[PDB]
Amino acid sequence: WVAVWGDR
Amino acid sequence: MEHKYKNHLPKIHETTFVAEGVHIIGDVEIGEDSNIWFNAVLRGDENSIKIGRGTNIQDNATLHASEVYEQSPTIIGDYVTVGHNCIIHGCKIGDYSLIGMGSIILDNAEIGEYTIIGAGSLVTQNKKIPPRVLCMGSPAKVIRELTEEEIEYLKNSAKHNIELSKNYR
Amino acid sequence: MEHKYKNHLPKIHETTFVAEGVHIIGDVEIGEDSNIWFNAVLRGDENSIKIGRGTNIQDNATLHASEVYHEQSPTIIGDYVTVGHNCIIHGCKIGDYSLIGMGSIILDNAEIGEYTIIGAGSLVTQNKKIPPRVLCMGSPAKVIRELTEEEIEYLKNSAKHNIELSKNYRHHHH
Amino acid sequence: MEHKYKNHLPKIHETTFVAEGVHIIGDVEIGEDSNIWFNAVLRGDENSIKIGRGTNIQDNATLHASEVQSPTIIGDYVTVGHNCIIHGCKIGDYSLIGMGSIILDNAEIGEYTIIGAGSLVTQNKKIPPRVLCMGSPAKVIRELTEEEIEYLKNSAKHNIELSKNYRH
Amino acid sequence: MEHKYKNHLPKIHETTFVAEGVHIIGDVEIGEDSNIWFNAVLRGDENSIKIGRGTNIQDNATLHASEVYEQSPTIIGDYVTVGHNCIIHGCKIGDYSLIGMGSIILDNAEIGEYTIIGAGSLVTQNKKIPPRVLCMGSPAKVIRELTEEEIEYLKNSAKHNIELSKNYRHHH
Amino acid sequence: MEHKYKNHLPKIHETTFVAEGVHIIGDVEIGEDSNIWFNAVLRGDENSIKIGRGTNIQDNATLHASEVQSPTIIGDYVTVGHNCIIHGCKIGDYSLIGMGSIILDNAEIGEYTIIGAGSLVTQNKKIPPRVLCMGSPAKVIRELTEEEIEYLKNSAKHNIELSKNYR
Amino acid sequence: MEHKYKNHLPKIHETTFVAEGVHIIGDVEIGEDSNIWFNAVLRGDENSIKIGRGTNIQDNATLHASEVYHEQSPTIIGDYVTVGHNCIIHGCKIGDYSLIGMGSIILDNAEIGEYTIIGAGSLVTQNKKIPPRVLCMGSPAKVIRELTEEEIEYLKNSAKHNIELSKNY
Amino acid sequence: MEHKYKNHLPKIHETTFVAEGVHIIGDVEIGEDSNIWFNAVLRGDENSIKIGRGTNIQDNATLHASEVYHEIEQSPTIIGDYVTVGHNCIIHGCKIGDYSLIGMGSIILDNAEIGEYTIIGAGSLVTQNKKIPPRVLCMGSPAKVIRELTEEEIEYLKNSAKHNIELSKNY
Amino acid sequence: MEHKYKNHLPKIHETTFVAEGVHIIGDVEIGEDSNIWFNAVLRGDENSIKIGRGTNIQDNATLHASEVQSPTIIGDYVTVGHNCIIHGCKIGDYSLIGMGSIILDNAEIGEYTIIGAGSLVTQNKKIPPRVLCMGSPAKVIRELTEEEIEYLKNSAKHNIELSKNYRH
Amino acid sequence: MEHKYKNHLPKIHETTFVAEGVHIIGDVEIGEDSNIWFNAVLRGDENSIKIGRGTNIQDNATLHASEVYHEEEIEQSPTIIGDYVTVGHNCIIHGCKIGDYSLIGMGSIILDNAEIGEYTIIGAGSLVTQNKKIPPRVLCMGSPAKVIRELTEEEIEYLKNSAKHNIELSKNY
Ligand SMILES: [Mg+2]
Ligand SMILES: [Mg+2]
Ligand SMILES: [Mg+2]
Ligand code: NA
Ligand code: NA
Ligand code: NA
Ligand code: NA
Ligand code: NA
Ligand code: NA
Ligand code: NA
Ligand code: NA
Ligand code: NA
Ligand code: NA
Ligand code: NA
Ligand code: NA
Ligand code: NA
Ligand SMILES: [Zn+2]
Ligand SMILES: [Zn+2]
Ligand SMILES: [Zn+2]
Ligand SMILES: [Zn+2]
Ligand SMILES: [Zn+2]
Ligand SMILES: [Zn+2]
Ligand SMILES: [Zn+2]
Ligand SMILES: [Zn+2]
Ligand SMILES: [Zn+2]
Ligand SMILES: [Zn+2]
Ligand SMILES: [Zn+2]
Ligand SMILES: [Zn+2]
């Protein structure tokens, strides 16, 4: 997974 | 019950409540007024587990970590609520946070303080969840900042579970 | 296995099967021919838990409820219900003959209608009202479709066999 | 920890490690050097459970089967993660079921395969060998890298060593 | 029209209607009053094909099965309707069901009796479709239970097709 | 190739091209310069099939109709693509049914319209003229461009000349 | 059955198996050990059709191509390819060992890389380029994932048995 | 450095730091304590470019505007105070509110408006005439509004803005 | 501004406008009234770069090609937007590459075609003339309207006008 | 070309090729045979930049890093690029670590605390967000990027040659 875009 | 692993014995504060069916193995430290509920497993054999003050680990949950030879131990702050049947795996959870029942937090993830993880969420490896937010889903997404009522609920949830545990033995 | 909480002792019917590793605490009432399987926790301290006749609470599951406030629903499970392995059943009402797929999570004030199937691994969120006689799954769980007459009949024949399965856990003559 | 069901007693190899809080019921066969961790439940009453050698069933997991029609067959050097639900499925050698996953009846997991944590593998799903599969419901993502294959080769063998450090 | 494969020849009932352009190969058994329409191909070389009574296999359809090394043959019950240009491949189809034209049913799938598959649908490998439902899409999803009149429509769909084929008095 | 059904024989123009392997049954009328390609099946037993002038029914396609409802009516200079299923519908002049499409009963396709390959036009669907329609279930996407309309004026006519080089 | 178109006669290898009901027209080349199954139509009148060695064109399929514009892809199928039942193969290029799921539609100027699987019922649109060694399916078709080496091994060991399947005719 | 375009010379505050490789052309106004970093191009020939106080235009970025017509209204490029435009961004005829952050590599097209205290994620594309509210997180290509900003993220935009000013002072 | 590579010097028409900060290296040819804007890099060291007449290469763009598989051939009256990467492709007359786009090796853009801002055109992709094409990876969206083809006939011609108001 | 920042001045090997228009600022270390192409900016003021040997930073690219907070609960990586790395045209490389022989496709963006394993290809136009760990020997692409598959031996052998050919390119200058 990766999917999420935590921050920026 | 308590189990030794190699040279490690659990270090459990004398005011910690430990319910029946619980197994605490090896290099585990649990602070004062914390309450570990029925059938939870805290296995500190691959890596250490540290639980602070007034924290509740609810029923049927599991705390573990991955093998080390960079890899993170399990570190749980003060006044944290780990809900029923959660899997807490090599992560860091900040003070006053609530891990929704049935959630899974994987290695090197970090949960900021005063945050709610929704029930049945999956926080995968190396994810950084900021403080004071609602984060939920599988894989979890940050949804929004918490309202003031929710921050208030967090101030009281862990403390209620302390009083709750006092009514037992 | 049974634990007191304040002035509440579990009320367990004498035909109830309670497997090893189970903990039943406080304000919990369990009806005739129900079966509580290995390592389940039924914690009736924040609120009451009531389980009807011939209902199965499967292994490693947890039943609880949220702290009551100033309005909180207790945990009420009807007759011939199947709560699958490792479910979390939290302050909700479950109607007769329904099947809660293993690993599901049912949150406070949710309502599962009778003769309804919740798919495995589902999450039924707070206050959700799931009608009777439907198939419902996902996370968060959505009503997929109405059940067929065959699926309803399967529910009526389910939990029954799940009681008999437990009868094989004791006795000497039969 | 061991329980009878009708004519069936668990056949557990002598070197198998069984933690406290475990309950093994009925038609359960567990091979050499396997380890069953705290509060796991292996209920072989509706159908049989067969577990090969060097396999670990981790804490608070549950193995069962639907009313009879595949039984639960787990190969060698398999890792079943914490709090998994393994239900009437087949799992091939060296595979890893990520913690909190659910595998339903007649599903088949190929050998040397990784199921990601929190996945759901539905009835009759056939997952190929040597892949990464994850999600709810799970999807096959890709073939595993050589480094992931090497990790699987070492995963259950390190878990066997982990168990020896305990009191048997 | 009929073709030998290894040591199988088709077992075709004497009342079976077989239109021109049809090819039936090998291990194929077809029951009384079934009707096989123009340019259909029933190839029983990899595995067996079994077709019950009063069933229609409509025009330009194909019946086959995957290689065997479980592994399902093709088994179709009584009074089934297989629509135009369908691909029926190593599956089981229960009595009175209707496969909408241009649909595809893959190996080890099972269609319950009295079930409707919508036209142009795709039922994938190992999928189990219950009786008495409407199932459609690509990949298909179970939609709902069939109604009383839909069931009644199934109870007559194959029978009308039998009667239609008997009007081919030149061809039988 | 031609088959009687009850009292009905196909009526086929003397300039209609009919490929080998075709089966035309019963109540079928096919107009001048039309071309029916290999292994196509035109079964006019439940209801009538009428095909206009200069129309092409491509290989392995099937034309039929539901039990009596709507007959199958195909206009002039129409293109029915390979392996299509044309079932009890009406198709207007110059239209093009993309290969592998399925048109169900009482559907109506306006003239100068393109059905994309592999589409499903559901029962009673009315598709207007001069549009592109596609999908499963098919939906009107957009109106046709000028090049696309110019293309439809040529498609069937080219298939006519194609069929004339045959024996 | 073979048919002339203009001055093109099909060029068919003497070991090619051609089943009954087949029609092969015009500019069509078919290689050794290939099998053309019942009621398939290979119409090489608008443009050429070229089929390699040990390739299987299954029953009720159609191979054609669009009117060429001299101002444009013929149909080119490599070695050991499987074209499933009732497929429509239209002016496209298909690489060695690939498998076209039954009932699929491949349109003009699409290219299917070698060692690739197209799922049953797919539609591969005009000019679509599918890489080698992938699973691709849907309508419109999309690349789902790479194939495993073992799945590729299956493709290599497959159409061999499919050639042998025709030897018994 | 600076280049004349017709009658227009850039108006640049004396405390503005202009790194090497920068080209500033024509009708360009740049305010106090702003920083234009290496190889940035600020081309005010089609329309004007106005940059407020304490704003950072980062390396290899481009500021321009589309050709104005005699129509339909063309927006100039207007950038507020304490804004951060990330590396290699393209800022094209849009308006950007105070304290906002344009994630590096983003593209903001003509007549678009970014509210104040807003974060555009790196690599985003904000299409023509799109209006992003204040105090939100926005990302993607095409970009969509994800959620409101947290108080911590808002405080970040405040505290970050000033830090970008001290950084240039050491040059 | 102009750099030799091996035996190659740029062949730049004398009416070509070349802004400050531009670097043109090696085997590059630029036609009459083309304009190369600030900080663009045109690096013809692996293959030739050929640019027609009246075409604009806007600021901070990069033109390169891959190892000796195409060179970079750009037609007449082409607009290449700011910060584009134009890599071993062929672009037809009057076409507009949206700013921030990426066109990779052996791609071909037909004439009178608009590429949307921030698009990625993958290797070997053939884009037909007179279409709108955008996304990452880019896909043909629709035919261009005659009002958009009208715009394309001005875009590069107005940029010729604009370049003349400089030191030119 | 070079610029000091506070007390830092770039440490650049004698064989490093630096093209025109380049700006290298502050705490930047670049190794032998590396080649920095036209208009690239390597701004080592917030945090350091280290570039190994044989590595190419292509035209118009930018290397930088986020502001450091000197907190211990906040891991904050500098920019660390290994040997024989190819950083494509107009890339933005930001506070991340890139392993030996990897290829960052032109126009890609790599954000702070991300790690790219060795011998890995990042597809052109991709975005790797903060704290993403990309394993070695894979193809990774998209926005935000996904790990697609392990690379083939033919793709690995290509990586073995890409950065060495760019070194060869820079010597003819
Ligand atoms: Mg690979
Ligand atoms: Mg691989
Ligand atoms: Mg591989
Ligand atoms: Na919760
Ligand atoms: Na009982
Ligand atoms: Na309670
Ligand atoms: Na679960
Ligand atoms: Na029950
Ligand atoms: Na998952
Ligand atoms: Na179809
Ligand atoms: Na006529
Ligand atoms: Na089409
Ligand atoms: Na060939
Ligand atoms: Na655009
Ligand atoms: Na396209
Ligand atoms: Na090194
Ligand atoms: Zn990951
Ligand atoms: Zn673990
Ligand atoms: Zn609770
Ligand atoms: Zn079970
Ligand atoms: Zn399901
Ligand atoms: Zn087949
Ligand atoms: Zn019909
Ligand atoms: Zn054709
Ligand atoms: Zn511009
Ligand atoms: Zn970009
Ligand atoms: Zn290049
Ligand atoms: Zn930066």
Residue numbers in the entry:
A (entry chain L): 1 to 8
B (entry chain F): 1 to 69, 75 to 174
C (entry chain D): 1 to 70, 75 to 178
D (entry chain A), I (entry chain G): 1 to 68, 76 to 175
E (entry chain B): 1 to 69, 75 to 177
F (entry chain E): 1 to 68, 76 to 174
G (entry chain C): 1 to 71, 76 to 173
H (entry chain H): 1 to 71, 74 to 173
Excerpt from the paper describing this PDB structure:
The 16S microbial community profiling of a metagenomics library from geothermal spring at Lisvori (Lesvos island, Greece) enabled the identification of a putative sequence exhibiting 95% identity to the γ‐type carbonic anhydrase (γ‐CA) from Caloramator australicus (γ‐CaCA). The sequence of γ‐CaCA was amplified by PCR, cloned, and expressed in E. coli. X‐ray crystallographic analysis of the γ‐CaCAmut structure at 2.1 Å resolution, provided detailed structural insights into how the mutations impact the overall enzyme structure, function, and thermostability. These findings provide valuable structural and functional insights into γ‐CAs and demonstrate a strategy for converting an inactive enzyme into a catalytically active form through rational design.
Structure‐based rational design enabled the design and creation of a mutant enzyme (γ‐CaCAmut) which possessed a heptapeptide insertion at the active‐site loop and two‐point mutations. Kinetic analysis demonstrated that γ‐CaCAmut was successfully converted into a catalytically active esterase indicating successful activity gain through structure‐guided engineering. The thermostability of γ‐CaCAmut was significantly increased, aligning with the thermostability typically observed in hyperthermostable enzymes.
